[PDB]
Write a protein that binds this DNA or RNA. Structure first.
Length: 96
DNA sequence: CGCTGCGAAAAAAAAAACGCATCCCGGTGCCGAGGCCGCTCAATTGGTCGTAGACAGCTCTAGCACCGCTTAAACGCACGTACGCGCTG
């Protein structure tokens, strides 16, 4: 048929339907959301990595992703992202 | 005479007429979203190994107080000049 290009578009849909259940999203914009995710992936991973290296750690922990997010994101956005991030970690650990 | 009243006359200014552009209404029609079909490869399980990082301390650096001598800046005020600021043609 054709090779398989991955995305984030299905995970954007799910989050869109959670947030505005009566709303669609044009291809062109779904692109722009994809780009966005990808951009803010590379940025948090990047700074995460730099943090690890700078401190001689070979392991990127949640602790790095957290500090990455505190450096990249502005005050309010950071707080929440730190909160939604910590929440997710706790609820994953406790599930096993 | 002065006052005044009026009658312009002069703008103001208003109003209103015109005509133009921006909105919105309601029925077309087209295409891409959104939703199914299979299906395939990437995530999960579970479980083995070995080493990154947590800790418990051991060292000696280097960063924080205190302390007067000695200046070179700071504060500051007064006087005056060059510049910033605004109006017009």
């Amino acid at each position: 048929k054709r090779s398989r290009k991955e995305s984030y578009s299905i995970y954007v849909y799910k989050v869109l339907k959670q947030v505005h259940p009566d709303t669609g999203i044009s291809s062109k914009a779904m692109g722009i959301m994809n780009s966005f995710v990808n951009d803010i992936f590379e940025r948090i991973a990047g700074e995460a990595s730099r943090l690890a290296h700078y401190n001689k750690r070979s392991t990127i922990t949640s602790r790095e992703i957290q500090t990455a997010v505190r450096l990249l994101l502005p005050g309010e956005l950071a707080k929440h992202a730190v909160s939604e991030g910590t929440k997710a970690v706790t609820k994953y650990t406790s599930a096993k």
